Amino acid sequence: MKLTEQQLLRIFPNARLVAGVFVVALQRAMDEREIDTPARCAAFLAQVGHESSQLTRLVENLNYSAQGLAATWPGRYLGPDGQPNALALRLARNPQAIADNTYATRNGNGDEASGDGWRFRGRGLLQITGRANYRLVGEALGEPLEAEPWRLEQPVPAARSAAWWWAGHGLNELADRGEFAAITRRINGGLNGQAERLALWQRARAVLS
Amino acid sequence: MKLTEQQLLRIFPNARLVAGVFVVALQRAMDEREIDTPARCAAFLAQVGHESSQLTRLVENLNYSAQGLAATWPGRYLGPDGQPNALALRLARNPQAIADNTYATRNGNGDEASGDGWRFRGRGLLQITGRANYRLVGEALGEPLEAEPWRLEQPVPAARSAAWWWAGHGLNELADRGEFAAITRRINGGLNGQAERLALWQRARAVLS
């Protein structure tokens, strides 16, 4: 394989500003994890491109309204009334407080007071969340992700972390067989955004063919 | 008073990469705090110019060697053999750990495990350090500096925080009287870097005359 910046802009047009640095980051991460054929690369690029809004969103958005908190984490933020409860009202529209509360004690995070929920909110192309996962990924990649979680918003850690996760979940062999929807299920635990993933995938297959 | 980009670049030649994004910030901050004459403005720009390396260094550098630790905080990191002690060896060349230890429980910071020391390390033109000071200044500027301390590395909060501190410590009236060395003592508690402060001062006086 070989990916050209021309090919990137045709697949991720909204990455014009980042495509220059991402092209080397992606090419190297893809070689590193044997994402090494048009079929493997098209599937990989289609999935990470959906999950990262074409390389423009590498950090999770926690700007929820009180109604959004109640819809998203109802066991936490929905009252017996069908209305946002008092906790939802207290945290509404405050991303740091939302993450610090919602993700406390999740995936190796400390408690609310630790600030771990915000500190280790989702980052990357295929997003990594929680202290223990930043630790695990940082150690697999030889980068200081637990100490510097913001590194996952930068091209090389984002690309290498996504390629590592991809190859480690058997997604290369799924791509070999053309089982794209089965890849979507493994990444999403469902088929949310499948229509969008499929359109990116068919673009990428045409470009990389 | 009016301050032009070309004037700023004549006072701060090394500001060439940021002058365009600092000129309005500085003009507005100076107006806001009555830094409103050539003499007040020349003194202010000379001091913030020295303290920020002509607007090129808006966050403190904590990349110390074990020897630098011992030399900079001899009381904390220097040993009786004139050698860095064991704590200094532990922390050497790790800025996060250095800040977390050296500044813990300083200026409202928590302990070394809180991470306050690094989180609220020095930022701005006249540098602000420590949780309680970020909260003090954020509240006085109406900016969310305690929640987002990195904002003090941006032009408007850096300039406004420096103008607020300047006017709040009587330095406008000292500038009125030409008492430049008195200003240095209030900022530095000594006369360190006075040669460079005076050089910038006389330059600023000529440009703004």
Author numbering:
A (entry chain A), B (entry chain B): 1 to 209
From the paper:
Most genomes, including the common laboratory strains PAO1 and UCBPP-PA14, contain a cryptic prophage encoding a glycoside hydrolase family 19 endolysin (named PaGH19Lys in the present study). Analysis of products derived from PaGH19Lys activity toward purified peptidoglycan showed that the enzyme catalyzed hydrolysis of the β-1,4 linkage between N-acetylmuramic acid and N-acetyl-d-glucosamine, classifying the enzyme as a muramidase. Our results support the proposed model, whereby uses holin proteins (Hol, AlpB, and CidA) in combination with the cryptic prophage PaGH19Lys endolysin , to induce bacterial lysis, which is crucial for membrane vesicle production, pyocin release, and biofilm formation.
Finally, the crystal structure of PaGH19Lys was determined and solved to 1.8 Å resolution. The PaGH19Lys structure displayed a fold consisting of α-helixes. The helices are packed to form a structure with two subdomains, the large subdomain (Met1-Leu55, Pro155-Ser209) and the small subdomain (Thr56-Gln154). The protein contains a deep-spanning catalytic cleft with an active site comprised of amino acids H50, E51, E60, Y103, Q127, T129, I187, N188, and R197. Among these, E51 and E60 aligned structurally with the catalytic base and acid glutamates in the structurally and biochemically characterized GH19 chitinases, suggesting similar roles in PaGH19Lys. Based on the structural comparison of PaGH19Lys with the well-characterized GH19 endolysin SPN1S, , the amino acids E60 and E51 were identified as the putative catalytic acid and base, respectively. These data support the idea that E60 is important for catalysis by PaGH19Lys. Comparison of the structures of PaGH19Lys and the SPN1S endolysin revealed substantial similarities, particularly in the active sites, suggesting that they have similar functions. The topology of the endolysin active-site cleft may reflect adaptation to accommodate the peptide stems of the PG.
